[PDB]
Design a protein around this ligand. Structure first.
Ligand SMILES: NC(=O)c1ccc[n+]([C@@H]2O[C@H](COP(=O)([O-])OP(=O)(O)OC[C@H]3O[C@@H](n4cnc5c(N)ncnc54)[C@H](OP(=O)(O)O)[C@@H]3O)[C@@H](O)[C@H]2O)c1
Length: 316
């Protein structure tokens, strides 16, 4: 298992990164410092997570301490839905760069294909509770992302939560200048994503798997919900390999040629989650894990199902 995957912009991306959604601002600086200390070189960020300033404090301190060089880090962030307008993309990127203490991002993603009305609220609502859309389409937002490459603000651009028809729309864009490098999507044994992964990989787009542990801290979790970390069948595979269930859940996407971004703010777990380069799941293990698919989504963007660009009506 090599530690990095080659992107279609010619750069290499570490296959293991640290997630930061829901990482409290008072804990994420230490989480990122610990992660870098124990070997992580890829941090997954977003403006909507409201903690990029604190992530940036950690990155800057580890650069200042010379624990790592900037060229050895792979920092990812995402353009929020209220910034899909052509005239807002650069400023949104610049705010993220300022907060992260960086002069470029390694990868900048369109967070969702759905654009929302600009303004202070991340989910602008009408009086009846529907999200208010923007009329800016996927393709004009993509052109604005391409400009960020040409201005030196980002080394690579990509997409997140795009279904295969939406990926295809980008790939078929008239005058396309840079292909998406990555599509970041939810993926784990209960949402195995075979069809969308095969499509993206066949086009040279690298897939990053989010919520690989099933996001047990997601705010809308219900007690009755499925639990990957507590699935006895997955625990059994872990026991056979003398690893933890989380380690199996992280190694699984790695062996599908995916990048994976488990989140933790717990120092012991941050270190545990990185110790996944010392064992191999068999093909039988992999097929068995794939068999657990239930089409179960942590992140359905449930308030936006009527948006014209809502991604999850299509089969994939
Ligand atoms: N592009 C998108 O739309 C999108 C959407 C969702 C997620 N993401 C990205 O993907 C990242 C990962 O997804 P996620 O945050 O939803 O969830 P996740 O990584 O599947 O699960 C995180 C949860 O698992 C716990 N955990 C971590 N390591 C563990 C271990 N070894 N043993 C037991 N529990 C463990 C964490 O607890 P502690 O933190 O308390 O240790 C936390 O509650 C996000 O943080 C974000 O960066 C992107």
């Amino acid at each position: 298992m090599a530690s990095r995957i080659l992107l279609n912009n010619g750069a290499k991306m570490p296959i293991l990164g640290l997630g930061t959604w829901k990482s409290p601002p008072g804990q994420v600086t230490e989480a990122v410092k610990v992660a870098i200390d124990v070997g992580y070189r890829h941090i997954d960020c977003a403006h909507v997570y409201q903690n990029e300033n604190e992530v940036g404090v950690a990155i800057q301190e580890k650069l200042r301490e010379q624990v790592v060089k900037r060229e050895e880090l792979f920092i990812v962030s995402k353009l929020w839905c209220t910034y899909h307008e052509k005239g807002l993309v650069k400023g949104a990127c610049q705010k993220t760069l300022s907060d992260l203490k960086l002069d470029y991002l390694d990868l900048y993603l369109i967070h969702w294909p759905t654009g929302f009305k600009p303004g202070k609220e991340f989910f602008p609502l009408d009086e009846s509770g529907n999200v208010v859309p923007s009329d800016t389409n996927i393709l004009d937002t993509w052109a604005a992302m391409e400009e960020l490459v040409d201005e030196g603000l980002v080394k690579a651009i990509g997409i997140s939560n795009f279904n295969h028809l939406q990926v295809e729309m980008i790939l078929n864009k008239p005058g396309l200048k840079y292909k998406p490098a990555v599509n970041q999507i939810e993926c784990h044994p209960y949402l195995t994503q075979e069809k969308l992964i095969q499509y993206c990989q066949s086009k040279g787009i690298v897939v990053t798997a989010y919520s690989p542990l099933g996001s047990p801290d997601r705010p809308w979790a219900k007690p009755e919900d499925p639990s990957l970390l507590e699935d006895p069948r997955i625990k059994a595979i872990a026991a056979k390999h003398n690893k933890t269930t989380a380690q199996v859940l992280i190694r699984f996407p790695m062996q599908r040629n995916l990048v994976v971004i488990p989140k933790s703010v717990t120092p012991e777990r941050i270190a545990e989650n990185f110790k996944v380069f010392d064992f191999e799941l068999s093909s039988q293990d992999m097929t068995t894990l794939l068999s657990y698919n239930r089409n179960w989504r942590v992140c359905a963007l449930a308030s936006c199902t009527s948006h014209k660009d809502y991604p999850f009506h299509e089969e994939f």
